């Protein structure tokens, strides 16, 4: 009878896992997207005898940090980072978040934002003189020229805070930004120091890293795994009827 | 014995939702159309002991005010409004109605109509001189030039009444025209004055705004939900049979 609670579980989690893959497919054009990885874990039920029932639960072990797409938009603010490199922004809850989105937007005040979250320099959030052409160098240095002024007056205003972190050291937060994990925070501190070896390319924008072949194969496997769970559920339901009829007379 | 009625309510309201979606899809070519939204509300039955029964009721919460795609037709009388803007016509029952259909037609007597409903201007319904060539400006102004006359003698005749109203202030009537809700009527008055901030484009007709993706997803969801409700009905139908036939 309780076999139905095994297969049904794999029927439920297959949906949950699908709800991951579909999400990855919904953000195929999202700038600076790190695809969520999905994996099924077999949790055994230990009890009194003949260890025989082993349920399955669908978990997401981090995300995929393989670099995303690389299109060339002739925009001096679009920036792309080298592999295992992150841009630093100020999160919604006054915290520190890391991202791969390089679509920096200059607010009317001249304060730089990425997705509405102001970008962070060595002096905190980076501000720029109002209405000035901005060019970002290959190491995060930012140069501002007031239009009409001669180019000899090009002066640097700040530097982007670029950090280095592997896929195991970072955890995706519910607002879409990555933060240091507990383990990584244990040895690297709450605030990541700037890495001077990170190289940043201006004038290109990094896309998503969702792989279509992996997603399509996973969806096919999910469908053809559910069907089997539905067959086992039907078999157990059919079996229970007789057993119930056994109780007569 | 009463879970069958819960499942039957779910299946019937799924049929109603499917009917709404099919009616929306049938008007994919209707000029200036607003799709009807659908939502399943849950009604919890309030008895004394365990409210373990909650039923489903289909609902249509207003309509969709997202503009559709403008077809450019080289005709001066087909007009398209700004986003969240409405043309005013005199309704079927001598009342006022609002619409997006900018397909303004003229009659032999010269009066402007939309779907046969005369259009309402500042001074009442707008009437154009018989058999004149008509141009509509970008703010509702209407100019009329008699055929075979110098274009210099063209002169404005009236101004269309263009209003601004959101989905919360607008409810669809049974004749296809949109009207003010009572809560919006209490605040903005019985009749809406002309809004001068709305720009109107002449020579472009607004189509329907039904989204095929949402419609197809809704149809798939309706089918699957109906199958699940039928399974629940079948499961309840066997148990009651056995129970009575045996415990007698």
């Amino acid at each position: 009878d309780h076999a139905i609670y095994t297969a049904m579980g794999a029927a439920s989690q297959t949906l949950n896992q699908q709800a991951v893959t579909a999400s990855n497919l919904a953000n195929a054009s999202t700038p600076g997207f790190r695809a969520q990885l999905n994996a099924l874990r077999a949790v055994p039920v230990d009890g009194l005898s003949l260890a025989t029932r082993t349920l399955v639960t669908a978990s997401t072990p981090g995300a995929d940090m393989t670099p995303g797409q690389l299109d060339y938009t002739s925009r001096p603010l679009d920036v792309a980072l080298q592999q295992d490199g992150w841009l630093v922004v100020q999160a919604a809850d006054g915290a520190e978040g890391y991202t791969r989105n390089g679509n920096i937007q200059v607010g009317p005040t001249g304060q730089l934002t990425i997705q509405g979250h102001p970008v962070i320099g060595e002096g905190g959030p980076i501000t720029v003189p109002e209405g000035s052409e901005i060019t970002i160098a290959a190491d995060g240095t930012i140069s501002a020229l007031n239009p009409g002024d001669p180019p000899n007056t090009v002066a640097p205003v700040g530097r982007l805070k670029l950090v280095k972190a592997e896929g195991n050291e970072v955890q995706r937060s519910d607002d879409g930004l990555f933060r240091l994990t507990a383990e990584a925070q244990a040895e690297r501190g709450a605030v990541l120091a700037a890495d001077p070896s990170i190289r940043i390319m201006s004038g290109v924008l990094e896309g998503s890293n969702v792989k279509p072949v992996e997603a399509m194969t996973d969806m096919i496997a999910n469908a053809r795994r559910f069907e089997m769970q539905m067959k086992v559920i039907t078999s157990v339901d059919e079996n229970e009827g007789r057993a119930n009829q056994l109780l007569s007379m | 014995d009463h879970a069958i009625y819960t499942a039957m309510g779910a299946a019937s309201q799924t049929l109603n939702q499917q009917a709404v979606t099919a009616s929306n899809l049938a008007n994919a070519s209707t000029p200036g159309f607003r799709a009807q939204l659908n939502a399943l509300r849950a009604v919890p039955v309030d008895g004394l002991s365990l409210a373990t029964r909650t039923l489903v009721t289909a609902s249509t919460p207003g309509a969709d005010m997202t503009p559709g795609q403008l077809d450019y037709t080289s005709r001066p009388l087909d007009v398209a409004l700004q986003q969240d803007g409405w043309l005013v016509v005199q309704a079927a029952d001598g009342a006022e109605g609002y619409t997006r259909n900018g397909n303004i037609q003229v009659g032999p007597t010269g009066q402007l109509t939309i779907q046969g409903h005369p259009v309402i201007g500042e001074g009442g319904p707008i009437t154009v001189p018989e058999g004149s060539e008509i141009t509509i400006a970008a703010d509702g102004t209407i100019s009329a030039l008699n055929p075979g006359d110098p274009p210099n003698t063209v002169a404005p005749v009236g101004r269309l009444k263009l209003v601004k109203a959101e989905g919360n202030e607008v409810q669809r009537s049974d004749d296809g025209l949109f009207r003010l809700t009572a809560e919006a009527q209490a605040e903005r008055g019985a009749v809406l004055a002309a809004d001068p901030s709305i720009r109107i484009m002449s020579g472009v007709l607004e189509g329907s705004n039904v989204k095929p993706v949402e419609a197809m997803t809704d149809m798939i969801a309706n089918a699957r939900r109906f199958e699940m409700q039928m399974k629940v009905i079948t499961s309840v139908d066997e148990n009651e049979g056995r129970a009575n036939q045996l415990l007698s």
Binding site: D1, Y5, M8, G241, L247, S248, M249 | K231, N239, R242
Partner: protein, 67 residues
């Protein structure tokens, strides 16, 4: 009791029920779990009915003891 699983969130900023962030809360009902619950409840119902019938038959036969 209301299940404590987190409510699902759908991004419909035009919905009146959407909060400041634009997320509408939708129920956390698991379809597979509910289907399996219905099936298992039906089977338990039938088993209990069979038990009750057998017990009633046993007392009917007990009513004719010694005869």
């Amino acid at each position: 009791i209301e299940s404590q699983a987190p409510e699902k969130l759908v991004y419909e900023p035009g919905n009146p029920l959407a909060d400041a962030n634009g997320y509408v809360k939708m129920p956390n009902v698991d379809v597979v779990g509910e289907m399996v619950n219905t099936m298992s409840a039906s089977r338990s119902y039938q088993a209990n009915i069979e038990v009750l019938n057998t017990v009633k038959s046993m007392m009917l036969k007990t009513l004719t003891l010694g005869q």
